[PDB]
Amino acid sequence: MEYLIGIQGPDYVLVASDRVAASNIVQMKDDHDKMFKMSEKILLLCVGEAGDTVQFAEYIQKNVQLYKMRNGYELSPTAAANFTRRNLADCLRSRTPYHVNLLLAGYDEHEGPALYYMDYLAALAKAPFAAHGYGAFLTLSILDRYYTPTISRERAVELLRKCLEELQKRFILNLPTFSVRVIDKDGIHNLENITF
Amino acid sequence: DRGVNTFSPEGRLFQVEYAIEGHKLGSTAIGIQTSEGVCLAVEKRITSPLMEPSSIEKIVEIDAHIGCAMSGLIADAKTLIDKARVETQNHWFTYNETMTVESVTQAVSNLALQFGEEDADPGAMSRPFGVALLFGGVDEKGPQLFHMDPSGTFVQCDARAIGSASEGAQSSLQEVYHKSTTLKEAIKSSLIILKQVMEEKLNATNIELATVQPGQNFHMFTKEELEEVIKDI
Amino acid sequence: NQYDNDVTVWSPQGRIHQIEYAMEAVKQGSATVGLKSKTHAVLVALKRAQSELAAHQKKILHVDNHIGISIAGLTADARLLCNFMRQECLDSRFVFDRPLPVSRLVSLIGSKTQIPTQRYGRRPYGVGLLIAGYDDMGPHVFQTCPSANYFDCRAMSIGARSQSARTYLERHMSEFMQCNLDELVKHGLRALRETLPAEQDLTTKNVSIGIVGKDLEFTIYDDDDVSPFLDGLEERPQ
Amino acid sequence: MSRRYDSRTTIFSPEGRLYQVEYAMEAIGHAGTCLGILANDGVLLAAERRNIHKLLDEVFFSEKIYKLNEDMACSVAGITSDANVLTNELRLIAQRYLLQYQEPIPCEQLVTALCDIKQAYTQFGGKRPFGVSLLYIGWDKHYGFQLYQSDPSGNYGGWKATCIGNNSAAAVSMLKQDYKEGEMTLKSALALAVKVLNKTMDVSKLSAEKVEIATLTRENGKTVIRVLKQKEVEQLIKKHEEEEAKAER
Amino acid sequence: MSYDRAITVFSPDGHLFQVEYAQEAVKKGSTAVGVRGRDIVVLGVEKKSVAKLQDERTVRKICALDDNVCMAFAVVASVSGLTADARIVINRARVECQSHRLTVGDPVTVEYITRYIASLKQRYTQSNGRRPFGISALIVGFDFDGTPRLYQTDPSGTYHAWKANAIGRGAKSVREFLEKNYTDDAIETDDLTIKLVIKALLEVVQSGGKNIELAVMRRDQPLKILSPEEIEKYVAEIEKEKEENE
Amino acid sequence: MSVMSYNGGAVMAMKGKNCVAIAADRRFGIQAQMVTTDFQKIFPMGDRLYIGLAGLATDVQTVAQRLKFRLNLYELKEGRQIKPYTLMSMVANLLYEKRFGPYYTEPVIAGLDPKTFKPFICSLDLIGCPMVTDDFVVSGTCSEQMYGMCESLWEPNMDPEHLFETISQAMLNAVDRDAVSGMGVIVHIIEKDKITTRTLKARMD
Amino acid sequence: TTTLAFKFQHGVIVAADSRATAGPYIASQTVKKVIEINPYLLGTMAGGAADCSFWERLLARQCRIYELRNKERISVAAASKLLANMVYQYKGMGLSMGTMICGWDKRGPGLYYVDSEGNRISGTAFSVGSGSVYAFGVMDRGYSYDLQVEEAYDLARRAIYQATYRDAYSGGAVNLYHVREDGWIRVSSDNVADLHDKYTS
Amino acid sequence: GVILYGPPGTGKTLLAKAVANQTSATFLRVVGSELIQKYLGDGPKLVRELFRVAEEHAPSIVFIDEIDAIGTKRYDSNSGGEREIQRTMLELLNQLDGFDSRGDVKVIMATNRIETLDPALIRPGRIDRKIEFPLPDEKTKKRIFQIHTSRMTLADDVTLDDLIMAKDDLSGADIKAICTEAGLMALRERRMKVTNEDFKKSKENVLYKKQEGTPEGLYL
Amino acid sequence: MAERGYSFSLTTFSPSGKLVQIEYALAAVAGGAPSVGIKAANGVVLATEKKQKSILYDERSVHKVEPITKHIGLVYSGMGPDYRVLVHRARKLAQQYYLVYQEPIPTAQLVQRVASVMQEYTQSGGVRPFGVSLLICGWNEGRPYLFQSDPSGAYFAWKATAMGKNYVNGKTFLEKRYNEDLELEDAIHTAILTLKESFEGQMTEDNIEVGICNEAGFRRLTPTEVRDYLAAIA
């Protein structure tokens, strides 16, 4: 681990997120023609970053859980519920041979409140917030993410903010990277935003 | 009252006696073993041809050189074959040879009777199987066909038929089949008997054909080849 | 009556009727002669097929390459006892690294047979096995029944029409013991042919032989070398 | 055991519904009426307390209504011994779900989990089902406000206004006309609730001890579960008798 | 926990008692019809007895085991079979459905899930102290090449692929009639697949277009459960079209 | 009520006393390691709705075990129409930590609460899995126990009103955050009347 | 994109490449090492890294593909077989496992090629390598890399890569194993001797 | 003969009496429970008489009403005891065919179910055909009601459809019960009129007693 | 154990709406010796009469009033054998609760916990439903508690209730004399009156036992004190 980046800035209802394409095992980038931003449902995204290998492992475990709860409700997921359950499940799985030690990012559209973004650590501490960053990148990004909105974001300033950070991650932080996926999810459709 | 786990005044088990008669309600298994392959013919047991033949399974591959056709109580058979697939494959996995038809047959026969409402638990039986199987495949020695029945008797077969009339299915065999005969006649000899043992018609959606042959795995017949064989009666 | 309604319910006969029903299952089963020498133990069994267009198959089932069984009763029930027996041989090899003592081996089976006989209405296993084994004591041919009681026999024949085979064992009671291994199999086929009427006589197809001993593993001859032994008739005049 | 003492306690019928379950419904009938009515801002349960005698310390809040969780409550109609096993487990599952998830427990979720245990007893085990039908009242953030019923077998159906106890058939029939699926405020809902107890209970003057109404309303951004006071129940009864005289002549 | 003496035992009748009681208990039931489309594969049941004092939520016969697999159960009988019985077969398949879905990278093979279903109802028949369920299920889903399937099980676990199959009210009666109804030009759009499900259900339903409950499922999007008011609009269109035919 | 480590980005409890009210002051801190992103999430919890128990360290098992304990407290609270005693709950927590055997993960519980229906002042801390801790004095607890302990002695007003304790406490919390990484990350101060809970949320990073 | 297991797919057909050699340092004991395991034509696998861990997971996988195929009758999804094996691998750690396998088999959308690790990676790419030596292999292959490479260019590309590898990092020896999966059913091209490849490049 | 089983109430009793007129067979009716009685040894003698008389009459059908009764109950109220039940049950079998092998005597057996019936009595090959009635539908119900409306006072206040619709897929008996309770109900009022009001009140009582829809609505 | 065992329930419902065995059990509690339990609201008193009828019982130990722990006590009704397990059971429960709370088991809580085990015993096979009725007293948390536990499993919280011989008469006297929130003196006096309602178990001091729970714990009373309370009733 101690590679791989995430950043999310939530807007008026939008949320923009980006992560790098690059799954490196050993010394070289094994996969890169796949993305590791997963649709766990069509209203919910988990973007996992830390261990390149570890991301799929966590995604799958949540995928069965998220659905079992969906059954229970028999209507779409609740954001509050998704942060706590994924947190509990992941702290217990960290000790497990099937580990987790990922900084994950929940994006969900909530049935009542609206847009929700849920913070998760590698240690795995649940918090809803509206200014948060993930991966090795979280130490680097979080003060900056504190500063640049007033409450939440505005997309124009965010766009400028995002391009500026993406030169920095290659510059100071060390990834194998050559392409980045930039996405805004409004809560019902996936939008592609442009790569820098 | 007393069990079905008790002996009858004949000096035979009550539950095993009932099981053979149970077979007779359902499907047929005809396997003819020739020295050019082992063929399995079984009835899909339809109510209409408007029942998709896309993935009706009753002849299933146990291994990729051994196939199995089932007869008798069709429901009870579905779990027996699924189970049979893992055990044959544990054997294939360890030995790394092509499984012999006689080894698969012996192994499944002890599972037939473990019945009893004492000395058994949920993973064990509380009833005997009434499924008679025909395992047909090609091994190192060559093509062999084995018959298994609920009493665990395993026997070597050159032609064995069991069906809706077990007795009926067999009497026709004597009449049609003869010891040394071609593959193409072997498939045909099954379609003429198949009708006799069924009370139902010859439809392409109502029969299922599979051949396991030298150098060649278990093959499932498609709608065109199902028709070639129906033509051969 | 109402004293065989379960095997827990005792009979005022001194032996439950249900124990005795199980004895009929074995009689209804295959004629089998079991004899021993002082090096080898031989199991001669009669095959049977369930169809006309079928080639008869062994009623000798392997426990292993050092202890082996012949079934008289149900094939399934014999195999059910067999699996336990197979395990013991697999453990014997781990612990002792010899062929498991035959007398020991039979008592553990007897313990298992004992259990449904204790349970409520449950079935005692309706096979009799003639068990041929070779240990450090010598060959043993044992008779096991549907009860937990085992007999150590010099020669015993169980199954269908076995009394005619039994008078043969009596006549050549001393002879088996001194003889060479080929002869031991030869008296067994002569005895086994005695069960059958004068008309019906043993042929290579329906003859299964299990030989175990000092010098060799358990081998089944179904047409492997059945023939030189088969040679010479001597049947009981019915 | 013995097979002559067995005619199969657990078995399937060709009519599809177990003998012991129909037999258990008659027992449910016997115990007093427990109802749930929906409000467009709460949900409440109204039940008649098992006790009616002078002598009662009043250690429980109400013998019938169990406060399970801070968003769920249930009432029991049927066998009280049988009630104690289901209500204690219920207390634990409902509570774990609100507490942890921060998402208020659905009745629909709750019932499916409990019904699995009830059902096991009817299909296998040689056992017998529970003597109670339980009415769940709660709010979940999914459907919204809800009411559920469970039966001895482990069969559920979700109503929004239902009554069980004696004169059930009559009650549900009255309830269909006046309430469909949402039209009554918390106060009308409560008035409707007192009305159903009135016809069905013999005593039509009632009392705060005789009936117990507990309400669940989300007020001031937190979900509040409260047992109403003897004064509050008595004020609702006094308001209901005036209106009773006028309604039916 | 389980019963020391077996509920299901081999006795002389040809099958078994509990299979025998179980075939009776889906025969005497109401109609549950499933038609296989080319858009959506749609299931519907005749009865829920809706009357506007109650709402369906999990009360539905149709429950989705998976993101693209769903099954509709007809436990339903002379006096009504048990939602309690169905739910067990549902719980066990759903966990298995999701584990296979995880493993295959395209929509879950129905085939696995139906074979599985058949073994679940059979294992209880061999298990001590247990008996099989008295349900018949319409296992539906799409394959890993996107092939729509409508499969059926009976109570003891036996399975077939079908174009369209109908169960309950005499299973044989209704399913032969669904062949007649079925058109391949009537499955070409989403409303036409749904219209074929509903026509078989109308036959003897008490207070139709309210009792009628049918749910739609998409290619790997979750189950969409239709409310009976919304279903009623289609029911009117066909019930007039049907009158016109006679 | 064992929590994984102590690293929760803040660990601090102070409880200080009056005769007219008693107060428990807490970090409202969340988020493990040095990096936080949040400053909100429950940590002190009302269990009779008028007594508190504070469980302290990392978020997950802190919230999880509290809630599972709440259910046993509740059982006892439910049945009788009067709620449980503080002294009996005080050994109950001690045992709950003890159930997690030798070489356990360290929590630090702080219970603050007036006793139910026998009215005297109560403050206590647990830590490790240890001997009984009934005191009537003052208690400060955490891994920087010494730093909290100082403050818990510092606020007692034996005769002033409830209000003066709050304003004193606001300065007490702040000075403590400049001294350790355990205080701060937002501060929730709870003044507990016996009949209800008053929650005040203090200004302070 | 590492060690002696590499597979990349192209526009004519697909190439599979492996060594058959074992023993870093003077130490050796296996000279006909079957890194590309394939007892059947339906599924193919590769090793990489640690000797024990590849062999163990792939013999468990060996049983696993056969079982899926048997159960469906027809061959199942390449993804399902591989992923059932991935759940086992993550859990498998604590044996000094560090398995790095490349799973290849035929899926219904087409050929499926997925990348397996002992820490449970599953991603589908056009090219995968497990180990540490293909770190060297990516420089000559990448430079010339087209995905519409001729059948003939690919055979020459593999042959040369081992010869050049031998020179660069020593370890090759005895035999060069080449396998081609053409259509959807696999064939082993040739077990061409090391001494030949040296001269050609 | 025939064995009449399924949902009770289909109109199992009407059917024997109606078919009997068409054939013009002498109709002997005797209850199965009446054959077990206090008297000792009178029980099988009576069963002989029942058969002997049926035979003499010549074309005959014996409708045996509620034969289900011998099996269901071990009465414990007869001095004849368990002995009585045994000896009766055999004699009917003897008289039917047996070695006697009497002809022209058809037995139509009315039972609740033949899964509650005694296994001695039941056996195929004395009764060649068994009929299982389906649950009566809305459709069958209208034709029966038009007949009862014709027998009843005629008005436009008779509303047939409403009552049939409301009810579920349930017996023929109910159609008869709604009409009989409606007339009775009228007498309570001091009215000789049977109107839509008597019917609506009748629908409730008949529906509860027979099977009752509000349990079933949950399970559906 | 060394057998197969049972698991089938011995109770099947009725189309009445009753469970058959619990109704037979209810007859056995009535056949007992009078046991009364009243929560005064200034302490809890449990009084019983014990049919020894020979006073050849050297009990300075076990009685029909036996302390479970130091502020819980138990009095039964009916038959002795069923009591023996329930008294041991209660002591075990007292121990489980003592470890965590270290204040011995509270009464509201005790009943729920006994009730759950009693219900199994009906519900399961190889066990049978009791035919004892327990009266449980406790003073803990500055409130007295009185509950009655039925042989089915059911628990009701009472102010005053009766069981044992001639309970119908007892409960009716209890309503008239005792009204809710009367004094400790009234609770004791009516308690001893119910025993006197019909005695017939040898009139000596060691043939009645009372045990009282109050603010300082639970102790059983010496037989000589018990007699003085009786002496007043004629």
| Structural contact between residues C32 and C159, judged by C-beta atoms closer than 8 angstroms | yes
- Structural domains of chain B sorted by starting position, each given as residue range(s) with its CATH number in brackets: 1-233 (3.60.20.10)
D-chain residue closest to B4, CA distance:
D3
- CB-CB neighbors (< 8 A) of I11 in chain D: 128
- Identify the closest residue of chain C to D4 by CA–CA distance: C5
Which of G1, G3, G99, G200 is catalytic? The answer is G1
Q: What is the 8-class DSSP label of residue I105?
A: P
The answer to whether the beta carbons of residues F36 and F30 sit under 8 Å apart is yes
Cα–Cα distance measured from residue D114 to residue D88, given in angstroms and rounded to the nearest whole number: 11
State the best of D99, D103, D229 to mutate against chain F, taking most chain F CBs within 10 Å: D99
CB contact under 8 A, H219 and E81: yes
The nearest alpha carbon in chain D to E49 belongs to D157
- Which one of E49, E81, E170 has the shortest CB-CB distance to H217? E49
- Domains held by chain A: number: 1
Show Cβ contacts of residue G155 under 8 Å, excluding neighbours closer than 6 positions: G15, G178, G189
Check CB contact of H131 with chain E, cutoff 8 Å: no
Chain A partners within 8 Å of F58 (Cβ): 123, 125
Answer yes or no: are the C-beta atoms of G100 and G2 closer than 8 Å.
Answer: yes
Q: Are G22 and G29 in contact (CB under 8 A)?
A: yes
Token representation of residue B106: 């012996």
G26 near G130, Cβ under 8 Å? no
Instruction: Report the candidate in G82, G87, G31 with the shortest Cα–Cα distance to residue G58.
Output: G82
- b/e sequence E133-153, b meaning 16+ C-beta within 10 Å: bbbbbbbbbbbbeebbbbbbb
What is the CATH classification number for the domain harbouring F75? 3.60.20.10
Residues in CB range of A51: below 8 A, 6 or more apart: A1, A3, A4, A101, A102, G119
The torsion defined by the Cα of D73, D78, D80 and D84, in degrees rounded to 10, comes to: -40
Domain boundaries, chain I: 4-232
Q: Which amino acid is at I219?
A: R
CA distance C19 to C117: 8
Which pair of structure tokens corresponds to residue I121?
């015993």
Resolution of this model in Å is 12.3
What dihedral angle (degrees, nearest 10) is formed by the CA atoms of E182, E184, E190, E196?
-10
CATH number at residue G188: 3.60.20.10
Distance, in Å, from the CA atom of I160 to the CA atom of D222, rounded to the nearest integer, reads 40
Q: Is H7 part of any known ligand binding site?
A: yes
Which amino acid does the sequence have at H204?
Answer: E
Q: In sequence order, which residues have a C-beta less than 8 Å from that of residue H49 and are 6 or more positions away?
A: none
CA distance D118 to I15: 20
Q: CB-based contacts of A125: which residues, under 8 Å, 6+ apart? A: A87, A119, F8, F9, F30, F31, F32, F58, F59, F60
**Cα Rg of chain B, angstroms:** 18
Q: Do D55 and I174 touch (CB under 8 A)?
A: yes
Check if the beta carbon of residue F197 is closer than 8 Å to that of residue F190: yes
Q: What subunits make at least 3 CB pairs under 8 angstroms with B? A: C, D, E, G
Is the minimum CB–CB distance between D25 and chain E shorter than 8 Å?
Answer: no
Q: Count other Cβ atoms within 10 Å, centred on residue B120.
A: 20
Q: Hey, are the CB atoms on G77 and E112 less than 8 Å from each other?
A: no
The whole-angstrom distance between residue B54's C-alpha and the CA centroid of its chain comes to 21
β-bridge pairing H131-132 and I155-157: unpaired
CB contact under 8 A, A97 and G94: yes
**Tokens of residue I209, six digits:** 């036992």
Question: What residue numbers bound the domain in which A73 lies?
Answer: 1-196
Among positive and negative, which fits the CA dihedral F114, F120, F125, F131? Answer: negative
**Count of domains forming chain C:** 1
Q: Chain B residue closest to C146 (CA)? A: B11
| Residue C59 dihedral angles phi and psi, to the nearest 5° | -105, 15
Q: How far is C112 from chain D (nearest CA, A)?
A: 22
- Please give the backbone phi and psi of residue C213, each rounded to the nearest 5 degrees, phi first: 175, -170
CATH assignment of the domain containing C133 = 3.60.20.10
Per the structure, the count of domains in chain G is 1
Please give the radius of gyration of chain G, using alpha carbons only, rounded to the nearest integer. Answer: 16
**Helix I107-123 to helix F59-79 angle, to the nearest 10 degrees?**
90
Distance, C-alpha I127 to centroid of its chain: 22
- At residue I179, φ and ψ (nearest 5 deg) are -125, 160
CATH number of the domain that residue A70 is part of? 3.60.20.10
Q: Please say whether the beta carbons of B225 and B211 come within 8 A.
A: no
Question: Checking DSSP bridges between strand F123-125 and strand F52-54, what pairing results, if any?
Answer: unpaired
**Subunits touching A (CB < 8 Å, at least 3 pairs)?**
D, E, F, G
Using CB atoms, which residue from D61, D91, D96 is nearest to F81?
Answer: D61
| Closest residue by Cα to residue D31 from D200, D162, D147 | D200
Find the residue in C nearest to B109 (Cα): C76
CA-CA distances (angstroms) from residue C235 to C164, C195, E233? 9, 8, 89
- The reply to whether G124 belongs to the active site is no
Write down the experimental method used for this entry: cryo-EM
Domain count, chain F: 1
Q: Are B82 and B94 in contact (CB under 8 A)?
A: no
D2 CB within 8 Å of a chain C CB: yes
Helices I107-123 and I80-100 sit at what angle, rounded to 10 degrees? Answer: 130
Q: Which of residues 196-225 of C touch D (CB under 8 A)?
A: none
Nearest to B6 among C6, C20, C78 (CB): C6
Question: What distance in Å separates residue A92's CA from the closest CA in chain D?
Answer: 15
Residue in C with minimal Cα distance to D2 = C120
Question: How far is Cα B220 from Cα F184, in angstroms, rounded to an integer?
Answer: 72
CB H1 within 8 A of CB H126: yes
Residue D242: partners with Cβ closer than 8 Å, 6 or more residues away: none
SS3 F55: coil
**How distant is the Cα of E146 from the closest Cα of chain B, in angstroms?**
14
CA angle E118, E120, E126 (to 5 degrees): 105
- Name which of E18, I230, G11, F187 is nearest D16 in CA terms: E18
CATH of domain I4-232: 3.60.20.10
Residue D176 contacts H, CB cutoff 8 Å: no
Test F58 with A142 for CB contact under 8 angstroms: no
Torsion of CA C110, C111, C112, C113, to 10 degrees: 50
What dihedral angle (degrees, nearest 10) is formed by the CA atoms of I48, I54, I60, I66? -30
- Identify the three-state secondary structure at position C208: strand
Looking at the complex, report in whole angstroms how far the Cα of residue H169 sits from the nearest Cα belonging to chain D: 14
Are the C-beta atoms of G16 and G135 separated by less than 8 Å? no
CB-based touch D/B (3+ pairs, under 8 A): yes
DSSP-derived 3-state class of residue B107: helix
Asked if D80 and I5 come within 8 Å (Cβ–Cβ), the reply is: no
CB atoms H218 and D151 under 8 Å: yes
Chain D contact present for H119, CB below 8 A: no
Contacts with D, E 118-147, CB within 8 Å: 129-132, 134
Note whether D79 and I19 are within 8 A (CB). Answer: yes
Token pair listed for E231? 């279903």
**From CA C96, how far away is CA E109, in angstroms rounded?**
52
> How many residues are listed for chain D in this entry?
249
Helices (H), E5-106: 17-27, 83-103
Q: Could you say which of C53, C57, C121 has the minimum Cβ distance to residue B5?
A: C121
Cβ E133 vs Cβ E25: under 8 Å: no
SS3 percent helix, strand, coil of chain G, rounded to 5, is 35, 25, 35
Domain that holds residue F15: 2-205
Residue A75 and residue A53: Cα distance in Å, rounded?
32
Closest by Cβ to F79, choosing from D59, D96, D99: D59
What's the half-sphere exposure (Cβ side, CA atoms, 13 Å) at H44?
A: 15
Domains of chain D (ranges, CATH numbers): 19-247 (3.60.20.10)
Distance from CA of E27 to the nearest CA of H (A): 10
- Residue G46 annotated as binding site: no
Question: Residue D232: which of D211, D203, D201, D205 has the closest Cα?
Answer: D211
Q: From the CB of residue D187, how many other CB atoms can be counted at a distance below 10 Å? A: 11
Residue H62's SS3 state is strand
Closest by CA position to D42, among listed D144, D171, D166, D192 = D144
- Could you give all domains of chain E from N- to C-terminal order, each with its CATH number? 2-239 (3.60.20.10)
Give the D:F interface size as CB pairs under 8 Å.
28
Rounded to 5 degrees, φ, ψ at I215 are -50, -35
Q: Which of D:7-66 have CB within 8 Å of H?
A: 14, 17, 22, 25
The sheet that has E159-162: what strands, in order across it? E62-64, E70-73, E137-142, E148-153, E159-162
